[PDB]
Amino acid sequence: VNTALQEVLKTALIHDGLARGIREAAKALDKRQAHLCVLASNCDEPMYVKLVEALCAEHQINLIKVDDNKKLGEWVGLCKIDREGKPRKVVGCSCVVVKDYGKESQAKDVIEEYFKC
Amino acid sequence: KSYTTPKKNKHKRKKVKLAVLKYYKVDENGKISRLRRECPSDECGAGVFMASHFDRHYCGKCCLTYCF
């Protein structure tokens, strides 16, 4: 679930397993070692949603629906300003590509058994 | 110091908004297409894209120039 997603995103942030942005996500997808991608819904996407569907609909690529763009930017560590309490301003992202290297967590197995269902 | 000669300025780079959707083109069916050509170099591999100029074809970091 979502706490499993934020825990595996934090583990990738610590062990350098993140590919943020959209063109870096496309390069990691065409390099054919991408495993999981996340697409944010309720966004300004007249063409982008079926564009990323065309990229992610080939084989072995799953999908995770997250509503708010600002909330998902916390888990990826896109910005961290004035960490004493709430952030001052964190800009939101669109897509994230993980590189699971520290592959020992119950969050990973619960998100994978969500994936294979 | 202001002199009699006019002052030169650096490149104020033109800003492009969402150019990645001009790399691929999507149809109404279920297929993915490549609008431009992919560089066949080894380290300059399958991630980067390559230009479409009026007379020549040039990549980004590996610098392989092709023309007709």
From Swiss-Prot, chain A:
Pfam families: Ribosomal_L7Ae. The gene is RPS12. This is Small ribosomal subunit protein eS12. GO terms for biological process: positive regulation of canonical Wnt signaling pathway; ribosomal small subunit biogenesis; translation. It comes from Oryctolagus cuniculus. GO terms for molecular function: structural constituent of ribosome. PROSITE patterns: RIBOSOMAL_S12E. Disulfide bonds: none annotated. Belongs to the eukaryotic ribosomal protein eS12 family. InterPro entries: Ribosomal_eL30-like_sf (IPR029064), Ribosomal_eL8/eL30/eS12/Gad45 (IPR004038), Ribosomal_eS12 (IPR000530), Ribosomal_eS12_CS (IPR047860). Part of the small subunit (SSU) processome, first precursor of the small eukaryotic ribosomal subunit. During the assembly of the SSU processome in the nucleolus, many ribosome biogenesis factors, an RNA chaperone and ribosomal proteins associate with the nascent pre-rRNA and work in concert to generate RNA folding, modifications, rearrangements and cleavage as well as targeted degradation of pre-ribosomal RNA by the RNA exosome. Subunit of the 40S ribosomal complex. It is found in: Cytoplasm; Nucleus, Nucleolus. GO terms for cellular component: cytosolic ribosome; cytosolic small ribosomal subunit; Golgi apparatus; nucleolus; small-subunit processome. Keywords: Acetylation, Cytoplasm, Nucleus, Ribonucleoprotein, Ribosomal protein. Part of the small subunit (SSU) processome, composed of more than 70 proteins and the RNA chaperone small nucleolar RNA (snoRNA) U3. Subunit of the 40S ribosomal complex. It comes from the Eukaryota. The modification N6-succinyllysine is found at K116.
Swiss-Prot record, chain B:
The gene is RPS27A. A zinc finger (C4-type) spans 39-62. There is a cross-link at K25, K31 (Glycyl lysine isopeptide (Lys-Gly) (interchain with G-Cter in ubiquitin)). Residues 1-13 are annotated as: Disordered. Monoubiquitinated at Lys-25 and Lys-31 by RNF25 in response to ribosome collisions (ribosome stalling): ubiquitination promotes subsequent activation of RNF14, leading to EEF1A1 ubiquitination and degradation and rescue of stalled ribosomes. Deubiquitination at Lys-31 by USP16 is required for maturation of the 40S ribosomal complex. The modification N6-acetyllysine is found at K22, K31. Part of the 40S ribosomal subunit. Part of the small subunit (SSU) processome, composed of more than 70 proteins and the RNA chaperone small nucleolar RNA (snoRNA) U3. Component of the 40S subunit of the ribosome. Part of the small subunit (SSU) processome, first precursor of the small eukaryotic ribosomal subunit. During the assembly of the SSU processome in the nucleolus, many ribosome biogenesis factors, an RNA chaperone and ribosomal proteins associate with the nascent pre-rRNA and work in concert to generate RNA folding, modifications, rearrangements and cleavage as well as targeted degradation of pre-ribosomal RNA by the RNA exosome. This is Small ribosomal subunit protein eS31. It is found in: Cytoplasm; Nucleus, Nucleolus. The chain holds residues 83 to 150 of 156 of the full protein. It comes from the Eukaryota.
